[PDB]
Design a protein around this ligand. Structure first.
Ligand SMILES: [Zn+2]
Ligand SMILES: [Zn+2]
Lengths: 39, 115, 225, 66, 258, 71, 59, 47
RNA sequence: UCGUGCCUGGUGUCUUGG
């Protein structure tokens, strides 16, 4: 069919948030779990 | 080891009464209702319904000890009105409310669902 | 949920000792009033602070003398003279209880007799201990004597009077347990797991507790420790 | 030892979400989006996955047989 | 001298949670229903575990405890069953229980995820939540380890053990704007707005309303999957109504017998 | 007799046998015994390491991958 | 009394389905250590049913 | 006619062990053994 | 058709509880 991504987007009604999870915040690290490969 | 079994909050022993009416002596037209195996669920709605009664001078409820599964409901009415019938009414009409609420919730569901 | 950088190397995140509990600091209904805490019964039902207490027992057999000798053996009400009021049949003919069997206080663990007909010398579960036998091991000691160890597990559910503590010096006994219907609640149904009485903070000046409770909140929502 | 079946506080089932959560950390996600993508709105339930230390993985190294 | 006449308004209805508004009712009624959703609605849950073979790395009761907390699909069946303590049977009945069965052996080399998939029910309806998204991890088995048990599920409610609580979390709320001053803010502008706040972004709390009752109770009942989130509600209303009917019966006996 | 024929390494016995093999290598002043021991040891090591990675092939493997990328 | 030391199941009343062992017994009651909880209970002897624990075929 | 079945702590093999016997595995000379699980009725309240 | 019953540990030291 003759169709474009610009047309595709228009078929939806409303689909198109909280972005602060990925903040730097030099006082906040990440977590650590149980591997089977370590010192 | 000493812990009460968990069924002890709702299950009636052998010989225990559900409900127990005691005429209070310190003022005229006053009773004390002692509910067994009940808590703040059942005692609060009755109290609050009783407060709606214009003929009711005093209404209240207590839990004598949170480890012992029992409530006390003290009702005092006007001389033309027993607390027996106060207490009766405040259950009767409160059931009528919850039944009407259940009915109304049901229709609201079935409208939500495709509607 | 709130860690120090130096608790990495203590290997604390691999082998931790505690739970992040939704603490409230409130004078809720008095039962926390003086170094006490009110715990969630519905949380404890879900395994919050549930534990296994293992107790372990040992026994070995010997050559006492020329006439005297110990052996692993079920006593009988026939030959063994000295003998307890107990239930000896919980243990099989080996004279050792099997793993998986339920035991209570002053039950017989290791059946043992010593020859005089035979005296009873058997080992009993400590009084008021009440566990389930978790594993039974049997071996030879240095002496070449038969040697067994038995460990018994008790599932210790948190109860009124168990001692909780914080990371800040805020010890306290569980003063009562309320169910989730009875706990206070936020604009969503987040009841506390533990409620501690505010009177613990002002005299003690554990500000770090508040800060931790504050940062833990940030940590759970930012979703990063 | 092993991820709790329910959030101790509220009672939401989190028991099914641990494999999925580690799977979303095989993807390049922040833990904050992993927790969100699994639908953990409350800060009670979110603690369960952040704070769970998986020791059953270490206990599994102690084979009984073979 | 009589009852008030409440109105309901469902705002959000999914297969996981319900948002509804109750109007024209007492604060006590509106909260007692919340207590009943948590503690007094019946569900089916594992409550009896007979362990035949357990070689996992966990305890015996750890297995049994985790089995207890697994939610079971209850809606069609839970208002049919006897409570266990009320069934005439000498052991268990299909009228008072549903029987479960777990038989797992790790033979392969890889580790075994003992999931709720393994819980085999005798009733096709009272299953773990698998129907229509992973499964509740029970244990992990190694090469040669196994787990055999049979289990029974009975009727109960959250007042006994949390395992019978049908809800994730009940979000009760009233008076989003501080109109009653039931709560007293030291700094009322430091406070974020409610979900429900019929207020502009200028002012902080509603002006004081001297003569006025709570109405408009905002609920957000979230299912654990053991019932539909809208069945939790119809069941709680019926549970509370039933406690009161029972209470009235006992009352009437007390009255006439004095 | 009964120690001879059945497949020896799995599960725990390979670690003590590896130690024993090392001791056998070390106690020998002869280079031939040393080299035979070395060969034997390497082979059993490889076999054992395969077996360990095989068991850890699933669900251990997955957690290994997240831990290396998280740090 | 005969059933002291035997494995019983509570078949009636609030404890329906709980297994235990009889630690003591009378003309009308027994004391049962429940297999599950850390507790011994006193119960009417008619509420019990013997389960036993045996193996057959002994060969 | 029950011979008391032990499990070897290192072979993991079943061993039949009557009285007056050395506690040795018959597969390899290891000296620790464990009793296998009971045959009795084991029942838990998921609670 | 049967009739028997309180055995039962002492000494030191470290850890920890209010
Ligand atoms: Zn939660
Ligand atoms: Zn039945």
């Amino acid at each position: 069919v003759l169709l474009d991504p610009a047309d595709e987007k228009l078929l939806e009604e409303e689909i198109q948030r909280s972005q602060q999870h990925a903040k730097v915040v030099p006082w906040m690290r990440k977590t650590e779990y149980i591997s089977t490969e370590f010192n | 080891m000493n812990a009460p079994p968990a069924f002890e909050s709702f299950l009636l022993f052998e010989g225990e009464k559900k409900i127990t009416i005691n005429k209070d002596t310190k003022v005229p037209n006053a009773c004390l209702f002692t509910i067994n195996k009940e808590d703040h669920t059942l005692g609060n709605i009755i109290k609050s319904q009783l407060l709606k009664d214009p003929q009711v001078l005093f209404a209240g409820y207590k839990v004598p000890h949170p480890l012992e599964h029992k409530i006390i409901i003290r009702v005092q009415t006007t001389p033309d009105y027993s607390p027996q019938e106060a207490f009766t009414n405040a259950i009767t009409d409160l059931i009528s409310e919850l039944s009407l609420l259940e009915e109304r919730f049901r229709v609201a569901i079935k409208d939500k669902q495709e509607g | 949920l709130v860690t120090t950088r130096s608790m990495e190397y203590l290997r604390f995140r691999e082998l931790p000792a505690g739970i992040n509990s939704i603490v409230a600091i409130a004078s809720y209904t008095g039962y926390n009033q003086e170094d006490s805490v009110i715990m969630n019964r519905s949380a404890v039902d879900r395994g919050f602070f549930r534990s296994v207490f293992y107790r372990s027992y040992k026994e070995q057999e010997s050559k006492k003398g020329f006439d005297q000798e110990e052996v692993f053996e079920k006593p009988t009400r026939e030959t063994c003279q000295g003998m307890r009021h107990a239930i000896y049949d919980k243990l099989d003919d080996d004279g050792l209880i099997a793993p998986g069997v339920r035991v209570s206080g002053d039950d017989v663990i290791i059946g043992k007799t010593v020859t005089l007909t035979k005296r009873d010398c058997s080992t009993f579960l400590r009084t008021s201990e009440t566990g389930i036998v978790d594993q039974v091991m049997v071996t030879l000691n240095q002496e070449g004597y038969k040697f067994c160890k038995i460990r018994v597990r008790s599932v210790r559910i948190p109860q009124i009077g168990d001692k909780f503590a914080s990371r800040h010096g805020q010890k306290g006994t569980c003063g009562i347990q309320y169910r989730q219907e009875d706990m206070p609640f936020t604009c969503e149904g987040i009841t506390p797991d533990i409620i501690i009485n505010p009177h613990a903070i002002p005299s003690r000046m554990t500000i770090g507790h508040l800060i931790e409770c504050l940062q833990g909140k940030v940590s759970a929502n930012k979703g990063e420790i | 030892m092993i991820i709790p079946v329910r959030c101790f506080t509220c009672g939401k089932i989190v028991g099914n979400k641990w494999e999925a959560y580690l799977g979303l950390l095989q993807a390049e996600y922040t833990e904050g989006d992993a927790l969100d993508a699994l639908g953990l709105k409350r800060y009670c339930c979110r603690r369960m996955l952040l704070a769970h230390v998986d020791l059953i993985e270490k206990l599994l190294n102690y084979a009984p047989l073979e | 001298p009589y009852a008030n006449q409440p109105t309901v308004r469902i705002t959000e209805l999914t297969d996981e949670n319900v948002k509804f508004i109750i109007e024209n009712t007492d604060l006590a009624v509106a909260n007692s229903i919340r207590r009943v959703f948590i503690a007094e609605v019946p569900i089916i849950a594992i409550d009896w575990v007979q362990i035949d073979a357990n070689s996992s790395v966990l305890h015996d009761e750890f297995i049994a405890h985790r089995l207890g907390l697994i939610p079971l699909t209850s809606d069609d069946i839970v208002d049919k069953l006897q409570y266990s303590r009320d069934c005439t049977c000498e052991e268990f009945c299909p009228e008072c229980s549903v029987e479960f069965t777990l038989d797992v052996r790790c033979n392969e080399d890889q580790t075994r995820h003992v999931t709720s998939r393994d819980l085999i029910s005798n009733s096709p309806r009272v299953i773990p939540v698998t129907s229509r998204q992973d499964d509740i991890l029970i244990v992990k088995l190694r090469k040669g380890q196994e787990l055999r048990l049979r289990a029974y599920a009975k009727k109960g409610f959250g007042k006994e053990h949390a395992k019978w609580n049908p809800t994730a979390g009940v979000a009760f709320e009233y008076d989003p704007d501080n109109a009653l001053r039931h709560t007293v803010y030291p700094k009322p502008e430091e406070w974020p707005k409610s979900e429900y706040s019929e207020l502009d972004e200028d002012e902080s709390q509603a002006p004081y309303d001297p003569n006025g009752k709570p109405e408009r109770f905002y609920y957000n009942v979230e299912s654990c999957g053991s019932l539909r989130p809208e069945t939790i509600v119809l069941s709680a209303l019926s549970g509370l109504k039933k406690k009161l009917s029972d209470l009235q019966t006992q009352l009437s006996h007390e009255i006439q017998s004095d | 007799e009964k120690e001879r024929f059945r497949k020896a390494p799995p599960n725990y016995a390979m670690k003590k046998t590896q130690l024993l093999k090392e001791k056998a290598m070390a106690e020998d002043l002869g280079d031939q015994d040393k080299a035979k021991q070395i060969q034997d040891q390497l082979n059993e090591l490889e076999e054992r390491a395969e077996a360990l990675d095989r068991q850890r092939t699933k669900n251990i493997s997955a957690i290994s991958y997240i831990n290396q990328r998280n740090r | 009394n005969e059933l002291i030391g035997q494995t019983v199941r509570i078949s009636q009343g609030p404890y329906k389905g709980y297994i235990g062992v009889v630690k003591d017994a009378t003309e009308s009651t027994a004391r049962v250590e429940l297999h599950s909880t850390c507790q011994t209970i006193s119960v009417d002897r008619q509420r019990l049913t013997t389960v036993g624990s045996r193996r057959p075929g002994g060969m | 006619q029950q011979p008391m079945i032990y499990i070897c702590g290192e072979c993991h093999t079943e061993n039949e062990i009557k009285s007056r016997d050395p506690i040795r595995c018959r597969e390899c000379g290891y000296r620790i053994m464990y009793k296998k699980r009971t045959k009795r009725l084991v029942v838990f309240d998921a609670r």
